[PDB]
């Protein structure tokens, strides 16, 4: 129904035709420019018989076919014009010698050129173009019309056509449509009566007074009707007192309202777009690919190092590639030469501050291998968002996690690590590593634990306890990665943003919170904080014990509904003495104030 435009010029044998064909059949509205350049004399042109509208310009240059039949072409919009001047550009459509020349331009239904002019020159055997009243078609009075220097030995125009025709036939006549209308219409009329103007949604002329009578839509087309906007995605339901998805929803693809975007198009906001913006991500909703805000930063996947890669370790030339990376396709290797520099390959030492680039990493598909770490960095808090180590690819003797000979590390600091899907674990020769002794690897390491742990020769458990380096009281029997309530494997009571807490803000505190599977989530804003009582039982405006501002149905709202469009018109409400939102009078136009008719607007 709707196809894209080509954007080339006179720039270009068999492929070119293939590209043209697949592109324009079976489309009706060209979102761009219709460019027909260098086409053979016996090429099938029936795939262009359904084109009704072209939003850009029409370029017909150096073709060899005898006739160009566009019987359904009604409107050339001219949003993009050729050489800044022409909506229609026809030039050089004839063969080197041979009788393979274009003789007829069949635009029998061409009614309107909204912007741009017409250029028809140097077509040796093209006739009848000098008889057409182009001013009847071209809306803009300032546009240039240049039709000259074409066919010289041309047949007279048929007597039925009255001197104006697209061809020599009796059905090839041009039908004049420009009429004289009254002042009330701003140049948009279908008759001379002041009550015979075109609809306000008509771009130019029209066949009648209705939505459905335009030659071209001023904004959008909805299944035959020219509309200011496509049907809204959301609609206020009077019975559920909130915005519900509209069944009649259509999205913006150019100037047409469509129920679903094409194959390679996503829905952002109200419109079909080529790709999703950097601030939003692609998600499947009700059958369609929609764009929704990432809630922070968007997922990004980077290639790793080690096994199956070009880098054996991350270094000065690699570290910059992991910016804003959440998932790592492969492994991470931290070797001695990578951290301190490689003289053989002339790679400088790594800047410790650049290691903070891994703070966005949530998952490592392969293994994690740390054999070298900066002296002043006594932990791996750089990997504090790391949740999963896949172990899909292993290191050495089947290791997925390997912390070796890091004599300055005091605690692990993997406070988000919850799963190591496969592989063995090797943590040794870290002489000052404490906290790891009490950790239950069964909860983290997936599968049978037996013989998959190789943890020894670290700081002895006796020295750690005597120095006070033990787990926080709020930690469960699972253990911890370091000191504090935010370093626990699991909490005894509740957790608030990765930090173990004794209780949520149930009865006091800002913001107020509710419990959900031993986790603290805040109440909806607009819940009035209750003194000595629970504020909410869950998230949402309908789970509040009392509304801060107003109440609409079961929900709490900041502002009473002041013109929210529903199924059959806008919906207005007012806040009564009990701050609850009540409907307005049925005969009110814009405002409310109160329930009575006298309070309107």
């Amino acid at each position, epitope marked *: 129904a709707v196809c894209p435009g080509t954007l080339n010029g006179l720039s270009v044998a068999e492929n070119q035709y293939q590209t043209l064909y697949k592109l324009y059949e079976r489309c009706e509205v060209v979102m761009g420019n219709l460019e027909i350049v260098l086409t053979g004399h016996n090429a099938d042109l029936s795939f262009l018989q359904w084109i009704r509208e072209v939003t850009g310009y029409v370029l017909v240059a*150096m073709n060899e076919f005898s006739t160009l039949p566009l019987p359904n072409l009604r409107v050339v919009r001219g949003t993009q014009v050729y050489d800044g001047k022409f909506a229609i550009f026809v030039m050089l459509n004839y063969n080197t010698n041979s009788s393979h020349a274009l003789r007829q331009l069949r635009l029998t239904q061409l009614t309107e050129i909204l912007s741009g002019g017409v250029y028809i020159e*140097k077509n040796d055997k093209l006739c009848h173009m000098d008889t057409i009243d182009w001013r009847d078609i071209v809306r803009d009075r300032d546009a240039e019309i240049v039709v000259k220097d074409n066919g010289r030995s041309c047949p007279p125009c048929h007597e039925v056509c009255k001197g104006r025709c697209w061809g020599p036939g009796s059905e090839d006549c041009q039908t004049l449509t420009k009429t004289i209308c009254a002042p009330q219409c701003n140049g948009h009329c279908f008759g001379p009566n002041p009550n015979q103007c075109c609809h306000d949604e008509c771009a130019g002329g029209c066949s009648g007074p209705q939505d459905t009578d335009c030659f071209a839509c001023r904004h959008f087309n909805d299944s035959g009707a020219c509309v200011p906007r496509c049907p809204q995605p959301l609609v206020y339901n009077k019975l559920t007192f909130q915005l519900e998805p509209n069944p009649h929803t259509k999205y913006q693809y150019g100037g047409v309202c469509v129920a679903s975007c094409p194959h390679n198009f996503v829905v952002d906001q109200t419109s079909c777009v080529r790709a999703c913006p950097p601030d939003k991500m692609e998600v499947d909703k009700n059958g369609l690919k929609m764009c929704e805000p990432c809630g922070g930063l968007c997922p990004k996947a980077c290639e790793g190092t080690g096994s199956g890669s070009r880098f054996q370790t991350v270094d000065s030339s690699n570290i910059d590639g992991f910016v804003n990376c959440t998932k790592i396709l492969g492994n991470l290797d931290f070797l001695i030469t990578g951290l301190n520099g490689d003289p053989w390959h002339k790679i400088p030492a790594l800047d410790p501050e650049k290691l903070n680039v891994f703070r966005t990493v949530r998952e490592i598909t392969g293994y994690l291998n740390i054999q070298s770490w900066p002296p002043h960095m006594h932990n791996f808090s750089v990997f504090s968002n790391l949740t999963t180590i896949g172990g899909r690819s292993l290191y050495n003797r089947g290791f997925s996690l390997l912390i070796m000979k890091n004599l300055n590390v005091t605690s692990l600091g993997f406070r988000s690590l919850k799963e190591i899907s496969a592989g063995r674990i090797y943590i040794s020769a870290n002489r000052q590593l404490c906290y790891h002794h009490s950790l239950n690897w069964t909860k983290v390491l997936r599968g049978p634990t037996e013989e998959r742990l190789d943890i020894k020769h670290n700081r002895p458990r006796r020295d750690c306890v005597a120095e006070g380096k033990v787990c926080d009281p709020l930690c469960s029997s699972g253990g911890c990665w370091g000191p504090g309530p935010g370093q626990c494997l699991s909490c005894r009571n509740y957790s608030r943003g990765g930090v173990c807490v004794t209780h949520c803000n149930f009865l006091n505190g800002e913001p107020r919170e509710f419990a959900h599977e031993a986790e603290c989530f805040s109440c909806h804003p607009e819940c009035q904080p209750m003194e000595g009582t629970a504020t909410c039982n869950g998230s949402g405006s309908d789970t509040c014990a009392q509304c801060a501002h107003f109440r609409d149905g079961p929900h709490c709202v900041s502002s009473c509904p002041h013109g929210v469009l529903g199924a059959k018109g806008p919906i207005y409400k007012y806040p009564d003495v009990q701050n609850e939102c009540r409907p307005c009078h049925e005969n009110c136009t814009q405002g409310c104030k109160g329930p009575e008719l006298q309070d309107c607007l």
Partner: antibody, heavy 120, light 114 residues
Framework: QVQLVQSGAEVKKPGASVKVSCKAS????????ISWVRQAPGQGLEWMGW????????SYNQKLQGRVTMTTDTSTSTAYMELRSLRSDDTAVYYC?????????????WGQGTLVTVSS | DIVMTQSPDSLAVSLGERATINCKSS????????????LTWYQQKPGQPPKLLIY???TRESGVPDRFSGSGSGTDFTLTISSLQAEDVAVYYC?????????FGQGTKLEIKR
């Protein structure tokens, strides 16, 4: 900059044929029209025809009665013109010129010209 | 075919004075579609190829001095030189920019009035 160098002088007997070259440089040769104009000694200018270098589509003057044929070589950026069945009157200086653009046939860049003299 | 007639055939103008050359075409050259006159003026000194001065009746080519000027419409056109210089002596040609066969005028020599 933009240059158009034509071939040397030619001397032919009545009934023979001439092929004159015109090598272009200094601009994109493909997107241009090349026109040919002749001028008899002491007489005025006369348009013979033009040709689009990109495809090779020409347009000749009917008064030459089908004796003129124009060609373009994209590889050498050279235009060629050919006159068949030569006459005494076809003794002229034959000029090779370029149209300024698509919208004007006016000849802005000319060649130095070649003298084609036809006599027995 | 269109016919271009230039008047006079030869013109003698003193140095620094003003020179006008007329051109009359058999058919109109004005295009109602854009109100543009497709008329071209050339200058040819003896021994060298012609030089383009003015196209579209009144528009000068890049490099052409301000003293050269074109006017007229439809079938009557005029080429004026406000102050004739010593390098301005040559034969001047009229040409149709409209269509086939782009006919040249018969030409007019301009000499210094001595």
């Amino acid at each position: 900059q933009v240059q158009l160098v034509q071939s040397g002088a030619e001397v032919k007997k009545p009934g023979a044929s001439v092929k004159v070259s015109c090598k272009a440089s200094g601009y994109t040769f493909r997107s241009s029209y090349i026109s040919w104009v002749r001028q008899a000694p002491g007489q005025g200018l006369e348009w013979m025809g033009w040709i689009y270098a990109g495809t090779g589509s020409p347009s000749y003057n009917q008064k030459l009665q089908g004796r003129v044929t124009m060609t373009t070589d994209t590889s050498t950026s050279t235009a060629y013109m050919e006159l068949r069945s030569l006459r005494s009157d076809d003794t002229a200086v034959y000029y090779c010129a370029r149209h300024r653009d698509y919208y004007s046939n006016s000849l802005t860049y000319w060649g130095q010209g070649t003298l084609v003299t036809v006599s027995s | 075919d269109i016919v271009m007639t230039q008047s006079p055939d030869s013109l003698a103008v003193s140095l620094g004075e003003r020179a006008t050359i007329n051109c009359k075409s058999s058919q109109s050259v004005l295009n109602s579609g854009n109100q543009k006159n497709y008329l071209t003026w050339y200058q040819q000194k003896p021994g060298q190829p012609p030089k383009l001065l003015i196209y579209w009746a009144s528009t000068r080519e890049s490099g052409v001095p301000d003293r050269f000027s074109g006017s007229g419409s439809g079938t009557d056109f005029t080429l004026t030189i406000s102050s004739l210089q010593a390098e301005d002596v040559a034969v001047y040609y009229c040409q149709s920019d409209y269509s086939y066969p782009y006919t040249f005028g018969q030409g007019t020599k301009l000499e210094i009035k001595r």
